[PDB]
Design a protein around this nucleic acid. Structure first.
Ligand SMILES: [Mg+2]
Length: 482
RNA sequence: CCC
């Protein structure tokens, strides 16, 4: 192909609606985890669109440099279109064809790619689309919403908008409602400024009504009810679900979360183990197992006033070892699972395995592509490890400051500001010229809206370090604020 | 998927 036809083709490729134009970046996920879990949903979450799953898996295989394997996934998608979408064959094929075009493009099979853009263009014309090479429709909006969700927390607002676009056309579509309600449910937990939210409660009730046979959507309703102090109602739903299904890991794992949150740890462990028989490598399941063992360990520690002896001490050590095992497995199976790192590191710290804790915290601090909320929490946990285990007040202060710089409204805000005030005040009693502590107080007072007091701290810090760029900038901000 |  002449490289002028090439430029034209590249332009068309960008106009398509498919995974390659949805800004799904590989660095935001663990590709092995995503590939593996897509396979596990194909087998074990049988209510989710198989067509969507294969289109997504094809994209993921491409991201792993396996273009030949991506093609095979798209072939399976085509088979499903014959199987499950025969009446609307052409329109249901658009996303698959888009991915074919992009994959063949990447394999330098330009003529083959053009064949696919041609098919797309023909169908869009046939169906009176206002665009040349796309036909926006609710089913595609839904598929896009799920693809966005799979790429993680940075994409949740975009996924919500995609499901909203689908619901604009079909407000009572059962599939669209599930996607939307689950997105709002995750957003209730995402980027919290304070208490957990419950905007998803209404959407979940509707999605459950619209999908009576679906235990997967119902388990989120139960969890949300638990969040809003209707634990009794939530638990009845859990019981009904467990009467209706067995061994479905995507349902059992959330029932296990439910039971754990009311401290029924043995029941949670029973459910998690049943799920592990089906999917023994799931990082989600492993994390949940560790959470159970950790909770049981904490109960013994509290009961024995943090001084367990004899068999209590033996059990505590077994539980710590088991929590480490499972948190380590979770992290190893999902490199982007922020909480797996901090939970593992914190458990290493609890067991006094400080070199191990440091190793994990170091990796966690270097995760560049997780959400700012997760970065914030990593700094908080490392700060606490520094303060209480390493007894390094200056390193603690440093990381508490980093936590607030990344996110200054969170449920950790007041824990962070109070720790900083406490540590900085103590250090200033010993050395009135301690620049880090002066600077820290300036930062916290500025955050609290105490402009004058903040200025005074920064001015003392600047007196000591007159050319400091950070202090000059802080003082300028304080002067120009209205 | 922590809290
Ligand atoms: Mg996952």
């Amino acid at each position: 192909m002449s490289e002028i036809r090439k430029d034209t083709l590249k332009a068309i490729l960008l106009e398509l609606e498919c995974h390659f134009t949805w800004n799904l970046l590989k660095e935001d996920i663990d590709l092995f985890e995503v590939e593996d879990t897509i396979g596990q949903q194909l087998e074990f979450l049988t209510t989710k669109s198989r067509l969507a799953l294969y289109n997504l898996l094809a994209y993921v295989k491409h991201l792993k440099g396996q273009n030949k394997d991506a093609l095979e996934c798209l072939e399976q998608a085509e088979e499903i279109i014959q199987q499950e979408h025969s009446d609307k064959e052409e329109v249901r094929s658009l996303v698959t064809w888009g991915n074919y075009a992009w994959v063949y493009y990447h394999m330098d099979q330009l003529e083959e790619a053009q064949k696919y853009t041609g098919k797309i263009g023909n169908v869009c014309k046939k169906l009176s689309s206002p665009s040349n090479y796309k036909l926006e429709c609710p089913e595609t909006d839904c598929e896009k919403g799920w693809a966005l969700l799979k790429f993680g927390g940075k994409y949740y607002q975009k996924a919500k908008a995609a499901f909203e676009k689908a619901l604009e056309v079909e407000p009572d579509n059962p599939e669209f409602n599930i996607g939307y309600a689950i997105t709002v449910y995750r957003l209730d937990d995402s980027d919290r400024e304070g208490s957990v939210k419950s905007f998803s409660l209404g959407p979940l009730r509707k999605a459950v009504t619209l999908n009576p046979d679906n235990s997967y959507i119902k388990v989120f309703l139960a969890l949300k009810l638990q969040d809003v102090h209707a634990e009794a109602e939530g638990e009845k739903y859990i019981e009904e679900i467990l009467d209706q299904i067995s061994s479905q890991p995507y349902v059992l794992r959330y029932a296990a979360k439910f039971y754990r949150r009311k401290n029924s740890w043995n029941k949670a462990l029973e459910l998690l183990k049943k799920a592990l028989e089906v999917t023994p490598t799931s990082s989600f399941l492993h994390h949940q197992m560790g959470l159970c063992y950790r909770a049981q360990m904490i109960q013994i520690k509290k009961a024995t006033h943090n001084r367990p002896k004899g068999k209590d001490k033996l059990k505590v050590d077994e539980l710590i070892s088991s929590a480490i095992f499972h948190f380590k497995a979770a992290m190893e199976r999902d490199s982007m699972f922020a909480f797996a790192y901090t939970d593992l590191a914190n458990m290493y710290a609890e067991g006094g395995q400080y070199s191990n804790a440091e190793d994990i915290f170091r990796k966690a601090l270097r995760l560049e592509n997780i959400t700012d909320d997760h970065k914030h929490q990593i700094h908080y946990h490392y700060g606490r490890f520094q303060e209480f285990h390493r007894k390094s007040e200056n390193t603690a202060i440093h990381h508490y400051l980093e936590a607030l710089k990344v996110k200054d409204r969170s449920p950790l805000r007041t824990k962070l500001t109070s720790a900083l005030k406490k540590l900085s005040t103590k250090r200033l009693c010993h050395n009135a010229l301690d620049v880090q502590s002066l600077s820290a107080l300036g930062f916290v007072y500025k955050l609290e809206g105490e402009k004058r007091q903040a200025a005074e701290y920064y001015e003392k810090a600047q007196k000591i370090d007159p050319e400091n760029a950070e202090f000059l900038t802080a003082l300028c901000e304080l002067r120009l604020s209205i």
